[PDB]
Amino acid sequence: MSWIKEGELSLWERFCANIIKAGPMPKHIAFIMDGNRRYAKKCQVERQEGHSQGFNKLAETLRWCLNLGILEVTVYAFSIENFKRSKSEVDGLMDLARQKFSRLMEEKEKLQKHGVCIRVLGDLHLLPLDLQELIAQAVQATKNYNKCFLNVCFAYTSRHEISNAVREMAWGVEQGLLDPSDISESLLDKCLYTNRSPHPDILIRTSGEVRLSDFLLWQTSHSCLVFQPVLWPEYTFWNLFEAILQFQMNHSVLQKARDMYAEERKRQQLERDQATVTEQLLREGLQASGDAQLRRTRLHKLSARREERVQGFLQALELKRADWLAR
Amino acid sequence: MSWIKEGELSLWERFCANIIKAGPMPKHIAFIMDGNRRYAKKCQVERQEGHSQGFNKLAETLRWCLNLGILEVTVYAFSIENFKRSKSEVDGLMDLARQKFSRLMEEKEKLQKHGVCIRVLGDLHLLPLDLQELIAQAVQATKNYNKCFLNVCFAYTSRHEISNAVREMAWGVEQGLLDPSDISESLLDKCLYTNRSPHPDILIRTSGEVRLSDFLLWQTSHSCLVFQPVLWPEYTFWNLFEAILQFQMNHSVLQKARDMYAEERKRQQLERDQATVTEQLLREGLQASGDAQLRRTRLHKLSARREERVQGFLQALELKRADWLAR
Amino acid sequence: LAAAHHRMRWRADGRSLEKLPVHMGLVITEVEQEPSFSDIASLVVWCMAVGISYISVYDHQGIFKRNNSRLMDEILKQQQELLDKDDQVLNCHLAVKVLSPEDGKADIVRAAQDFCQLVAQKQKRPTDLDVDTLASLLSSNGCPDPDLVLKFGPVDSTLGFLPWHIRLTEIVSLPSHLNISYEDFFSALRQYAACEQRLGK
Amino acid sequence: LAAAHHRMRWRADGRSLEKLPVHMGLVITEVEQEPSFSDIASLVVWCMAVGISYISVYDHQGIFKRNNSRLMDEILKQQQELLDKDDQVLNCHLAVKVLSPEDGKADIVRAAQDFCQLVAQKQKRPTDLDVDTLASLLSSNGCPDPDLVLKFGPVDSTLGFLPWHIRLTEIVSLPSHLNISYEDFFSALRQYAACEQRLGK
Numbered sequence A, B: 001m002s003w004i005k006e007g008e009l010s011l012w013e014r015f016c017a018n019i020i021k022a023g024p025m026p027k028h029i030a031f032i033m034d035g036n037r038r039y040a041k042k043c044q045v046e047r048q049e050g051h052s053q054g055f056n057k058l059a060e061t062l063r064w065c066l067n068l069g070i071l072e073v074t075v076y077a078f079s080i081e082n083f084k085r086s087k088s089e090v091d092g093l094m095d096l097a098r099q100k101f102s103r104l105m106e107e108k109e110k111l112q113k114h115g116v117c118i119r120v121l122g123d124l125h126l127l128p129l130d131l132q133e134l135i136a137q138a139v140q141a142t143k144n145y146n147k148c149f150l151n152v153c154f155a156y157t158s159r160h161e162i163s164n165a166v167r168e169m170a171w172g173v174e175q176g177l178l179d180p181s182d183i184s185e186s187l188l189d190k191c192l193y194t195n196r197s198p199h200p201d202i203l204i205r206t207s208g209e210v211r212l213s214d215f216l217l218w219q220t221s222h223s224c225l226v227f228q229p230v231l232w233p234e235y236t237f238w239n240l241f242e243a244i245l246q247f248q249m250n251h252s253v254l255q256k257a258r259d260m261y262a263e264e265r266k267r268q269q270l271e272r273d274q275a276t277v278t279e280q281l282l283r284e285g286l287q288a289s290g291d292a293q294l295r296r297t298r299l300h301k302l303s304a305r306r307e308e309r310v311q312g313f314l315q316a317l318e319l320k321r322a323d324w325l326a327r
Numbered sequence C, D: 001l002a003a004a005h006h007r008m009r010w011r012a013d014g015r016s017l018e019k020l021p022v023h024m025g026l027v028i029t030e031v032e033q034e035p036s037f038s039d040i041a042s043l044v045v046w047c048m049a050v051g052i053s054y055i056s057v058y059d060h061q062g063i064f065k066r067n068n069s070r071l072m073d074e075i076l077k078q079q080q081e082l083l084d085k086d087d088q089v090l091n092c093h094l095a096v097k098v099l100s101p102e103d104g105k106a107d108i109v110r111a112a113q114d115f116c117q118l119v120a121q122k123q124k125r126p127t128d129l130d131v132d133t134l135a136s137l138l139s140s141n142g143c144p145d146p147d148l149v150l151k152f153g154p155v156d157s158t159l160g161f162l163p164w165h166i167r168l169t170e171i172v173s174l175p176s177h178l179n180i181s182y183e184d185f186f187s188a189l190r191q192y193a194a195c196e197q198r199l200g201k
């Protein structure tokens, strides 16, 4: 019962890996680990065994990722919506998480060996207090570790994460750390649970569903989406390989669209700021332009004072986030 | 009595010319032909002979220019202020101009040989009617000629030229051809008497005076200024050479300053236009920026409609300028 | 009167499905230099004919937003052909929205600015912004979320289409909207009708 | 009381010249990264001490215009040293103008816009704008034109300094304003005093 198998790639897996690694490779892949219960019914086994096998496949898939040089992975492990399942199944999932997390602690120091950082993202106050303590110990121990990153989304939905990010920024203006005008797409990005990682290059959902089910909606707006029919506990290296092949095919147009979005956003921001500086210069009676370069220094100070407030807000938010007596 | 001697450069003149022509050469030189009367007193000859010798030096200096590949020359020949001199001297200058101009007409077709375009710039309605007719015939005949350009500034001051340019633009808005907002530095430039030539690369004044005496004040704002002590009728190839040497030494910093001025002007114009588009968008209730790229097409149409009005105004002004029954 | 029969057939087609989308998004991932408004307009008219209440047209470059008049002109053209201009114009503007990237993340940021402004005016509390209140605050208002998105073209991405609203949208991909046929459009509807939505249970 | 003697000596120096400029321009053609406000301020203080009414400071890059406070601070510093702050401050702002390129051609264009606006309001005629009326219209107003310009540095150009106003300005060139001495400044004044102005006659 461990978080990552230790197997090396076979000849054909290794060969195909070398080939695609000549092209652009994803740095961060997100997985919606869907189909555990259908898998259990197909193999005529209990639902708890389908979920346990699902965890085993997660451990195996992380080893594939590491063997492919993909060093950050985010997985959907428990939705807030999944609290609506039967107590029998929910208790089974909570028990599984309790047994995998503690076991991570027994298997600790081996996490120090491979530099594995474990983060658990979601509205964790809805979990059993004992499970929160096991989870809290997890992030505490594996913080400051560098070689790879696993983000487990537990008691998570995207709407709840986006709502919390807005609440965080609202808390900022309530504390005098932020002006409501400082709120921006970049700032909301830095208030998500995922704020320590780049947006996923690939979002993979198994079992043939073509929906996102409230997962990383903000972060995957420009991610390559891969919907594969295989049920999660039957995921293979070749399913993962196919998803990466999809990513390489999309990469040129996708990075262009990503850059064009960013260039348009930064630009529309410049025009809003120039317009605001103009409004302050329409008032006070000064000129719209002149050799004195007045609007230029007003623009410089507007953004610098904005960046100062933002940097100060993020540090207080990070300190509040690291303020935990829960571990 | 002709407008340009036919002599070729001597060995040393020719040699020094080849050397400097390896560097940047002026395309347009302006001359303030000062010192004729002091020259006459120094040689113990009548003032009329000093001015006649002054004309001879103009003819010789134009040949030097042509031999140096400098194909446009502007000269200060008569100031409006010079009407305040004695009738004896003024009559002498008007007589000289009458005799040189008609003689240009007798020596015509030879102007067709060397493609010489003659322009006479100033408030010409202050001249004797006969002299206006001789002058009017001059520009009429030598229009459409290409190989070189001589601009004679007669009954001219810069303030009177700038005032006339503003009156021309004011006439434009009176006729519905211009909006008062269309008035710009570039448009005023295109309403000067000199609007068919580039600004002078060099402004030369002889006799040791270090003033401009109301000559080409707008056009020479970024021109290399050369004040030489020699009296005009004693001007030599080497005085002209020294002035060009001055120009080559200044050229790097001067063209940088010229370009920086132009970059700052075009830029301040962009900011005024963006501010105006913003004001129209503050009103009407629309946004300062958006994916619809609204301010972009408003900016495009603002300038295009401005350029259309300007192009239409200049054509009517040019037609009014070419509307002459004075020749 | 033949237009009444065509309306009857399309109504029967929509009614025959196990379920119909209330709000469909059309995400064009590749718009050509001369946009194919006629193909988009036909998709929109088919949606309205089969009984879909709302249609959102989307491209990442904002081409349809900057050509909104030409698009509605073509929609109204094809709405009359093979199917009181003011009522027809008003009904298309109620049912059809032309969207661009700024309707997604930028609008969520707009809502966050508005709400934080109330916090700064001591009129609301940070804890007052829950999931349901934020949804009310977006410029989607009472409009239902898209339940089906038809994604056209070679890009395997939603490209910034209403991220908040597509938490449960079914995303059906077709290769091209160009010369798109009613049968191909309806086959996409059959796929959505047969999908199983469990909502976490 | 030694400051009264210094004021007396500088007054005698200015009075001793055949003529003194009423309005001097200081055109700096090369401003260094750290501008030498102390050298400029000394030039300004010497002008005011010898009896020159107006001083215009100019550079093509607008550095002195964008550092106007530091410049006046240094002028007031040296005005007290070796020579009621509000009266001293007011008198320097009346006598000293810091100019940039926009005070030349751009201001003439401003005046042309203002006058053409009156033409468009049927309030003035195109023939109403003569030479004298345009001069009144510029933002120079009743201030006299510069009669002497001290041009410092290696550029043989006025670099856009008040083109309308320098129709008869004497332009005296010195190599550098850096560590400029009173003797060098006064020698420039002697040159201007000895110049002959004929006004076209």
Ligand SMILES: CC(C)=CCC/C(C)=C\CC/C(C)=C/CSP(=O)(O)OP(=O)(O)O
Pocket (backbone or CB within 6 Å): A033, A034, A035, A036, A037, A038, A039, A051, A052, A054, A055, A056, A076, A077, A078, A079, A082, A093, A096, A097, A100, A101, A152, A154, A207, A232
């Ligand atoms: C993080 C950790 C240590 C453990 C939790 C992760 C594991 C092992 C399983 C995820 C639980 C769920 C609900 C997976 C979705 S498949 P489904 O249940 O929706 O099956 P279905 O789609 O109905 O076939």
Ligand SMILES: CC(C)=CCC/C(C)=C\CC/C(C)=C/CSP(=O)(O)OP(=O)(O)O
Pocket (backbone or CB within 6 Å): B033, B034, B035, B036, B037, B038, B039, B051, B052, B054, B055, B056, B076, B077, B078, B079, B082, B093, B096, B097, B100, B101, B152, B154, B207, B232
């Ligand atoms: C265009 C043409 C055909 C003829 C006119 C051009 C000629 C020959 C002479 C220019 C007349 C004047 C006033 C020259 C200025 S020198 P000055 O008189 O000011 O002498 P000074 O400076 O007092 O020594």
Ligand SMILES: C=C(C)CCOP(=O)(O)OP(=O)(O)O
Pocket (backbone or CB within 6 Å): A032, A033, A034, A076, A077, A078, A079, A081, A082, A209, A211, A213, C197, C198, C199, C200, C201
């Ligand atoms: C932990 C996970 C993968 C939750 C999302 O899968 P769901 O099964 O709960 O999503 P739906 O199909 O019910 O929408």
Ligand SMILES: C=C(C)CCOP(=O)(O)OP(=O)(O)O
Pocket (backbone or CB within 6 Å): B032, B033, B034, B076, B077, B078, B079, B081, B082, B209, B211, B213, D197, D198, D199, D200, D201
């Ligand atoms: C035709 C010319 C060269 C007029 C300018 O010279 P002036 O002699 O008239 O100028 P001032 O010295 O009198 O100012």
Ligand SMILES: [Mg+2]
Pocket (backbone or CB within 6 Å): A034, A035, A036
């Ligand atoms: Mg499922």
Ligand SMILES: [Mg+2]
Pocket (backbone or CB within 6 Å): B034, B035, B036
């Ligand atoms: Mg003279």
